[PDB]
Amino acid sequence: AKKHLKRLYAPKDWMLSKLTGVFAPRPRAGPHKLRECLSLLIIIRNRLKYALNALEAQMILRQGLVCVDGKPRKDGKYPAGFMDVVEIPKTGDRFRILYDVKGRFALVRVSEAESSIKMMKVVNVYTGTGRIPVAVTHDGHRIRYPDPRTSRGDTLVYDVKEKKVLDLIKIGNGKVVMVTGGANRGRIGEIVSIERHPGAFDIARLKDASGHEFATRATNIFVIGKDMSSVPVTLPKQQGLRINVIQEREEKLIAAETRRTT
Amino acid sequence: GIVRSRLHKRKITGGKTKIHRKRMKAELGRLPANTKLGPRRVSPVRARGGNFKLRGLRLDTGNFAWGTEASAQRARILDVVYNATSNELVRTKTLVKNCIVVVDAAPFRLWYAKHYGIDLDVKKASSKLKRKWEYRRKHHKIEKALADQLREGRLLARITSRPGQTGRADGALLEGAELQFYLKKLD
Amino acid sequence: RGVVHSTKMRRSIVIRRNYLHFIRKYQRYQKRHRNITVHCSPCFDPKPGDEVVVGQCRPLSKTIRYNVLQVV
RNA sequence: GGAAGUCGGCAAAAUAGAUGCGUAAGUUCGCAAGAAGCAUUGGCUCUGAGGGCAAAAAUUGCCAACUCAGAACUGCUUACGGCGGGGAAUCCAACUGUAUAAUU
RNA sequence: AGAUACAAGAAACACGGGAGCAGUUCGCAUGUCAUGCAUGGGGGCGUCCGUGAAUUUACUGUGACCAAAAAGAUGCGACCAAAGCAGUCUUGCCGACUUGAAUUACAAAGCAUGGGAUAACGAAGCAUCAGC
RNA sequence: GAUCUGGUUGAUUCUGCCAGUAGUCAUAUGCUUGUUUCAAGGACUUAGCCAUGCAUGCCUCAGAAUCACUGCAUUGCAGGAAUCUGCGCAUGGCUCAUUACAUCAGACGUAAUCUGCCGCCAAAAUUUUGCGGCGCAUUACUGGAUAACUUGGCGAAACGCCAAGCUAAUACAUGAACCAAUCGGACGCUCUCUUUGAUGGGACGUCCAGCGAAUGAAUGAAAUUAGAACCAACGCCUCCACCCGGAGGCAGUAACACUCAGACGUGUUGACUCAAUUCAUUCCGUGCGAAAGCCGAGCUGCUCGGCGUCUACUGACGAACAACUGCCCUAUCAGCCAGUGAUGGCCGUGUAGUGGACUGCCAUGGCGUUGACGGGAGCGGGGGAUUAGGGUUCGAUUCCGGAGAGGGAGCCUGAGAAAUAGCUACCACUUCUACGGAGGGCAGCAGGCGCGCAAAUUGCCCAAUGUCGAAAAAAUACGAUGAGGCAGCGAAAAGAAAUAGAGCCGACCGUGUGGUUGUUUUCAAUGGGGGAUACUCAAACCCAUUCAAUAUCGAGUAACAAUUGGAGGACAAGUCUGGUGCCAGCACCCGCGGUAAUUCCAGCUCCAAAAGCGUAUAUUAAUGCUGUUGCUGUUAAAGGGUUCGUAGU
Ligand SMILES: [K+]
Ligand SMILES: [K+]
Ligand SMILES: [K+]
Ligand SMILES: [K+]
Ligand SMILES: [K+]
Ligand SMILES: [K+]
Ligand SMILES: [K+]
Ligand SMILES: [Mg+2]
Ligand SMILES: [Mg+2]
Ligand SMILES: [Mg+2]
Ligand SMILES: [Mg+2]
Ligand SMILES: [Mg+2]
Ligand SMILES: [Mg+2]
Ligand SMILES: [Mg+2]
Ligand SMILES: [Mg+2]
Ligand SMILES: [Mg+2]
Ligand SMILES: [Mg+2]
Ligand SMILES: [Mg+2]
Ligand SMILES: [Mg+2]
Ligand SMILES: [Mg+2]
Ligand SMILES: [Mg+2]
Ligand SMILES: [Mg+2]
Ligand SMILES: [Mg+2]
Ligand SMILES: [Mg+2]
Ligand SMILES: [Mg+2]
Ligand SMILES: [Mg+2]
Ligand SMILES: [Mg+2]
Ligand SMILES: [Mg+2]
Ligand SMILES: [Mg+2]
Ligand SMILES: [Mg+2]
Ligand SMILES: [Mg+2]
Ligand SMILES: [Mg+2]
Ligand SMILES: [Mg+2]
Ligand SMILES: [Mg+2]
Ligand SMILES: [Mg+2]
Ligand SMILES: [Mg+2]
Ligand SMILES: [Mg+2]
Ligand SMILES: [Mg+2]
Ligand SMILES: [Mg+2]
Ligand SMILES: [Mg+2]
Ligand SMILES: [Mg+2]
Ligand SMILES: [Mg+2]
Ligand SMILES: [Mg+2]
Ligand SMILES: [Mg+2]
Ligand SMILES: [Mg+2]
Ligand SMILES: [Mg+2]
Ligand SMILES: [Mg+2]
Ligand SMILES: [Mg+2]
Ligand code: NA
Ligand code: NA
Ligand code: NA
Numbered sequence A: 001a002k003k004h005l006k007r008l009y010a011p012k013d014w015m016l017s018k019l020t021g022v023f024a025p026r027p028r029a030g031p032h033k034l035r036e037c038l039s040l041l042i043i044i045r046n047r048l049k050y051a052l053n054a055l056e057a058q059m060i061l062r063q064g065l066v067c068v069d070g071k072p073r074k075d076g077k078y079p080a081g082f083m084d085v086v087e088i089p090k091t092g093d094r095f096r097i098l099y100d101v102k103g104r105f106a107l108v109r110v111s112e113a114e115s116s117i118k119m120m121k122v123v124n125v126y127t128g129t130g131r132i133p134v135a136v137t138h139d140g141h142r143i144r145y146p147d148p149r150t151s152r153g154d155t156l157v158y159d160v161k162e163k164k165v166l167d168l169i170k171i172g173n174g175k176v177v178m179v180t181g182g183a184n185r186g187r188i189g190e191i192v193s194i195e196r197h198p199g200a201f202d203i204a205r206l207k208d209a210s211g212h213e214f215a216t217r218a219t220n221i222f223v224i225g226k227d228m229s230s231v232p233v234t235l236p237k238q239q240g241l242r243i244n245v246i247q248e249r250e251e252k253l254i255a256a257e258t259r260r261t262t
Numbered sequence B: 001g002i003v004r005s006r007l008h009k010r011k012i013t014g015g016k017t018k019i020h021r022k023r024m025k026a027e028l029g030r031l032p033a034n035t036k037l038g039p040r041r042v043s044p045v046r047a048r049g050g051n052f053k054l055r056g057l058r059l060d061t062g063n064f065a066w067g068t069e070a071s072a073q074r075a076r077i078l079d080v081v082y083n084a085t086s087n088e089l090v091r092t093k094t095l096v097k098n099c100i101v102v103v104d105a106a107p108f109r110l111w112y113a114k115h116y117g118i119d120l121d122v123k124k125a126s127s128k129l130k131r132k133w134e135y136r137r138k139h140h141k142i143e144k145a146l147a148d149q150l151r152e153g154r155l156l157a158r159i160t161s162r163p164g165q166t167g168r169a170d171g172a173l174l175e176g177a178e179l180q181f182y183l184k185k186l187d
Numbered sequence C: 001r002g003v004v005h006s007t008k009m010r011r012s013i014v015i016r017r018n019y020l021h022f023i024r025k026y027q028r029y030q031k032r033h034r035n036i037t038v039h040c041s042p043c044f045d046p047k048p049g050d051e052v053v054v055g056q057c058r059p060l061s062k063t064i065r066y067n068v069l070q071v072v
Numbered sequence D: 001g002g003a004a005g006u007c008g009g010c011a012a013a014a015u016a017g018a019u020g021c022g023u024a025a026g027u028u029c030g031c032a033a034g035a036a037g038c039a040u041u042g043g044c045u046c047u048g049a050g051g052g053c054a055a056a057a058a059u060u061g062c063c064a065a066c067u068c069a070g071a072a073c074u075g076c077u078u079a080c081g082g083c084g085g086g087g088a089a090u091c092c093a094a095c096u097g098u099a100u101a102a103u104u
Numbered sequence E: 001a002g003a004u005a006c007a008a009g010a011a012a013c014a015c016g017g018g019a020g021c022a023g024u025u026c027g028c029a030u031g032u033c034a035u036g037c038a039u040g041g042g043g044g045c046g047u048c049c050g051u052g053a054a055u056u057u058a059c060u061g062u063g064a065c066c067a068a069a070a071a072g073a074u075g076c077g078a079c080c081a082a083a084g085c086a087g088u089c090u091u092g093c094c095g096a097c098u099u100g101a102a103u104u105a106c107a108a109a110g111c112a113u114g115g116g117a118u119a120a121c122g123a124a125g126c127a128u129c130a131g132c
Numbered sequence F: 001g002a003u004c005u006g007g008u009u010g011a012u013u014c015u016g017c018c019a020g021u022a023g024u025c026a027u028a029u030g031c032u033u034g035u036u037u038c039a040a041g042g043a044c045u046u047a048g049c050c051a052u053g054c055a056u057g058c059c060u061c062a063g064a065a066u067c068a069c070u071g072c073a074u075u076g077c078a079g080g081a082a083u084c085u086g087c088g089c090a091u092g093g094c095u096c097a098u099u100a101c102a103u104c105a106g107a108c109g110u111a112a113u114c115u116g117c118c119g120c121c122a123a124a125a126u127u128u129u130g131c132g133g134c135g136c137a138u139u140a141c142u143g144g145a146u147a148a149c150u151u152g153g154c155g156a157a158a159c160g161c162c163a164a165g166c167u168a169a170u171a172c173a174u175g176a177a178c179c180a181a182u183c184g185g186a187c188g189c190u191c192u193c194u195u196u197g198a199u200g201g202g203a204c205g206u207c208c209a210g211c212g213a214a215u216g217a218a219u220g221a222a223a224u225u226a227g228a229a230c231c232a233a234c235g236c237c238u239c240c241a242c243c244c245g246g247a248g249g250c251a252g253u254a255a256c257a258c259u260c261a262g263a264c265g266u267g268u269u270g271a272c273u274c275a276a277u278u279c280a281u282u283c284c285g286u287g288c289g290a291a292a293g294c295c296g297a298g299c300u301g302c303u304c305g306g307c308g309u310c311u312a313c314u315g316a317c318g319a320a321c322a323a324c325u326g327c328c329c330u331a332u333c334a335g336c337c338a339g340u341g342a343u344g345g346c347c348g349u350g351u352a353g354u355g356g357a358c359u360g361c362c363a364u365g366g367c368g369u370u371g372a373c374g375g376g377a378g379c380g381g382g383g384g385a386u387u388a389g390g391g392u393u394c395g396a397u398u399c400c401g402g403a404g405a406g407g408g409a410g411c412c413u414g415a416g417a418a419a420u421a422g423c424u425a426c427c428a429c430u431u432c433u434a435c436g437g438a439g440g441g442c443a444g445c446a447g448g449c450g451c452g453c454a455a456a457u458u459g460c461c462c463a464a465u466g467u468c469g470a471a472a473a474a475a476u477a478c479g480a481u482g483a484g485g486c487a488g489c490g491a492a493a494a495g496a497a498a499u500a501g502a503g504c505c506g507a508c509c510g511u512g513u514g515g516u517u518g519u520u521u522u523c524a525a526u527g528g529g530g531g532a533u534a535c536u537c538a539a540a541c542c543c544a545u546u547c548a549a550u551a552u553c554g555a556g557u558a559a560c561a562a563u564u565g566g567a568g569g570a571c572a573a574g575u576c577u578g579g580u581g582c583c584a585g586c587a588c589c590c591g592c593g594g595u596a597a598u599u600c601c602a603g604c605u606c607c608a609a610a611a612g613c614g615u616a617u618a619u620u621a622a623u624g625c626u627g628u629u630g631c632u633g634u635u636a637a638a639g640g641g642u643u644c645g646u647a648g649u
């Protein structure tokens, strides 16, 4: 149906100025939802600054030169999202798309060995034609023979070069999760308890590394390891530790003032 | 044309609704098939999203299931005898879902002989088939009404498919209290 | 939840919901009501004045969208 | 063509049974009212509703009479007799009735 | 340890297809035609079944779920300002792991505290009372 | 800024209105206008009518060139007009007529459904071809058509048309055995073996056994009690060394008559008649190619990469339904709904799917003073104006949702339309004609007529932001785009800011050697303007820099000249001087004008605010004159003649 997207209607986290054009590229159907993605044109032009226009980005994209899951993508409207690895072999850049502690997208550099793994969350399990069990993933993958103890809410570690599952981490008390949506996105905490409420949304109660408690809907949590030292991916700078706004302003003012002394 | 919307209906308060906007293709209806009984004739209809529906016009045969024995046979429909909507449908010989019909009973008689050895060619059988017949007949029991109908040459059945939507006339034989309920009406 | 209002139709009853509406300008409340028609199974036998719990289902008639789940 | 005829629509034409829907001003609230007006109507083959009397009784059996309501098919040359034309106003007498056998 | 009170977030039964191996607490055996390369008091977990004479709303505290633009707000001498989300300098084949914080948005709805003021129920007191 | 003032009396204290006052991205009109930045702009009335021009197309190394096309070679290499094929045109843009159980907003659903392009994936059905007449194999070298073209042409024309003759495919139509697996259902005049004919065991052969769809059957768990004894046949363990036949008992023990001694005894949800498995009978075009496809590399005979396409399944982008709460005025609108569906029930039909959505039968229900039914104004929201607080009022208009394309109805193709720069007909308007006929739809951009108090160029460009697409850019070799941007017009509105600065002398001022007015003067500065080695820009323009870097014009009456309203009060500013004489006129209100006008018409002075300032209409505050916070009711307007009394509080 719809084929356009106005700038005022575009997601706030793309950081598009309202005085530069009427339109924004709208994402196509694909791995990630429209409101929770980051298109390839935005990354190449606005984040990495490798291109000055959309014409220059089209020169880079319609050549390969950019892989998003180990496969080159020639579409500037490809929706890239959480836990994706963007590689540019010509310049030797490898990034992973995570969430900042303020809920914004963040590109973190990864090593060559770490760039071949990925974490995916199960969302559904069903049975195929040949009595084949398949698990559906938040990214949109369909894995045809998961471990027989794979459940709907947990996560499994994937190798994108050799398409095989590395291991499976189930969801339970005392595990480390990341919040992936709503007023708490980007925070990291331990699971304390989960309230059920059948027929409605479950509520997950979590505890921060500094001891602060917060709650969110159980569909917004993403298991990343059994403990903070066993997380198999690199985390952003702040490590998901939200701090007070008053204190944060004070530190920002103290800095850039000592810088002016130097 | 025909529509299936609630815009032309009165409100529960009895008031009349003032209609703005025109008729949309998403709410169309179509003219009924009115399937009769005769040599097979169908008419394709292109439905929403591609796909084809089959309109039944003058069907005369189908697959009828013997539920107790968990089998089915291909039989020819002979006539329509009852309809819970109106006698007009019975008079005009219209095949719809839940109609009560009769079938020729020849395929079901043949299956019974080859499965149980009872004839309502049997004597020319292998010894191991004869032994198998004795086992099956050891703890199997047929009922009064079914055995009488199979001897007579016809038995009653009800249509289970929707002939106007799929172009098929399939059904199940009547048994149990259902057979008694419809036998008393057909008197 | 609601209160049984009438049980005249076949396998159907009318329940009434009473609630208070807040008018901001006067900082006061006013009383309102709403009537809903639901389907009742023969396993229940409600009478006017009773209290029932209903749950949403697919459209069953022109005006029926709820089914009786429990009579208290 | 349609009252131009004539003192004057005199005379003729015209409406018409039954069923469904609908019906103004005025009024003494009873009426006005069949106000005005629109539609259907044949033939043939079927379907439903409306009852009595017996029995060791939401059952079974036997039986009478002619109304009403529907459906399919088919047809018209609008086709016996019998059967209100309607409306808007003015004058007089309240009304039913009587009354110059042989011009009122 | 039992009784007195209180706890249907409770008591009393049961489920290995129940706890990533049947949770926490006071080399020898089985199998060997095997990839058998296997296997070796009391209290919390999950899932069902009987037990109430069952307790609920309003209100209030704290959090969830809530497009942008616009409105309130932090920071930055676009020469100032209406603006904008930029920009700054150790003179850079660069750096600041640069920034772009954080708010309000009726009424209804949803989670878990509190029980003072209220409101919805029930009862009209021999239409009752069974003691372990 | 939590603010008030003038008018009723001979004077006083009140009630109450009229008038004054401030704002409005709020419209219009009048006078005036030097510089610069940022901006709304035919909505109001007529969803009135339209001349002309332009607004949606797309080719890569990778579907199809014998142009009787072009450039080089000399039986080739390139570019390729035109046509066929594939995808898109259901988006964007415009407008606000309709519209109150509708639309919309916040919260929820679809277990009631459809879903092209995109992501991750899946695939073991099928007797074909050649040769010799059923046999044998180096078993995939398959078929007719039709456009562009040429040969006749018809017609006044028409985004009109006919016939014949050529030739392509990733168009259309047919078609593939072995290689090549496991898995289980019916049978037999067929063999072989063990017992006394066996639901006996093994072979042999003969019909079915792929995804999807239809009907019927089974599975889709269990979770309320502990020990014994007999008989049927099933599995094991002991004898009497084994065999023969003929004895006696439960140690252990997931299942399963071999080649597989663990090759699912366990789907999912809050919940399922759902997912999936097995068995029986079916599918006739209304389904299922390895496109019998196209390019690159390397070594007739092979190897490796990049693309393209049919079917099945579920994520994303969506579509369509349903409705928990909420939304202006009106009772001089009190009852509404049922022949012909009104409220519910039963079996069906129709739909992608639920449903009185619809056919038949049955019952008498459903809604309403907590305002139904009827009428009036009106697209809904995010939001704007006015800000002590509470409130009042506006929202055609940039973002989201809905609806429409003169009116109104119907429909084809498509994954999606009841589509309008798609088709069909009628109504109202309307264009060309050779009079036979053929056309039209600006509420897209620019422009015109009319209407009105009321609103801009028939401009430049795809450089930026995006959309479509066979598509990166470049090279023998340049997609479209009035969507969008840029400039022109533009005192709607908003920001910054010139119209002079510093002194000497002389004569004067009013306080009492300082404060300042005037005319002859001097002496620096600066723009408005003129230009450029140039900067900007798609190009041009505006802004910004500069008036030598060897080498760049300019202020003195700085004529480079500020306006619009006022001077009795409200309300800042004259008891000045002429003219008129209840006339002319002023005056929002009180009032002025008949010979000495503080008010008219003028001159001179003075006041307000200023590149702006008056006037009209609407609206907010003034207004505690709509009062919930927060009014009044003895005499100013206002307590029912008295009791009873229901809904309500
Ligand atoms: K009359
Ligand atoms: K009489
Ligand atoms: K139904
Ligand atoms: K299509
Ligand atoms: K462009
Ligand atoms: K004078
Ligand atoms: K008052
Ligand atoms: Mg005459
Ligand atoms: Mg005459
Ligand atoms: Mg006469
Ligand atoms: Mg009357
Ligand atoms: Mg009549
Ligand atoms: Mg008389
Ligand atoms: Mg008389
Ligand atoms: Mg007489
Ligand atoms: Mg803002
Ligand atoms: Mg006096
Ligand atoms: Mg080419
Ligand atoms: Mg085409
Ligand atoms: Mg649109
Ligand atoms: Mg919403
Ligand atoms: Mg095969
Ligand atoms: Mg097994
Ligand atoms: Mg309107
Ligand atoms: Mg609006
Ligand atoms: Mg309007
Ligand atoms: Mg505007
Ligand atoms: Mg406009
Ligand atoms: Mg439309
Ligand atoms: Mg028009
Ligand atoms: Mg249309
Ligand atoms: Mg047009
Ligand atoms: Mg125009
Ligand atoms: Mg190119
Ligand atoms: Mg080109
Ligand atoms: Mg435009
Ligand atoms: Mg200005
Ligand atoms: Mg001047
Ligand atoms: Mg200049
Ligand atoms: Mg004067
Ligand atoms: Mg004055
Ligand atoms: Mg004064
Ligand atoms: Mg005025
Ligand atoms: Mg004078
Ligand atoms: Mg006011
Ligand atoms: Mg006030
Ligand atoms: Mg008075
Ligand atoms: Mg009184
Ligand atoms: Na007075
Ligand atoms: Na200038
Ligand atoms: Na200038």
Ligand code: NA
Residues within 6 Å of the ligand: none
């Ligand atoms: Na495809």
Ligand code: NA
Residues within 6 Å of the ligand: none
């Ligand atoms: Na409005």
Ligand code: NA
Residues within 6 Å of the ligand: none
């Ligand atoms: Na819209």
Ligand code: NA
Residues within 6 Å of the ligand: none
């Ligand atoms: Na038209």
Ligand code: NA
Residues within 6 Å of the ligand: F455
């Ligand atoms: Na104007």
Ligand code: NA
Residues within 6 Å of the ligand: F623
């Ligand atoms: Na007021």
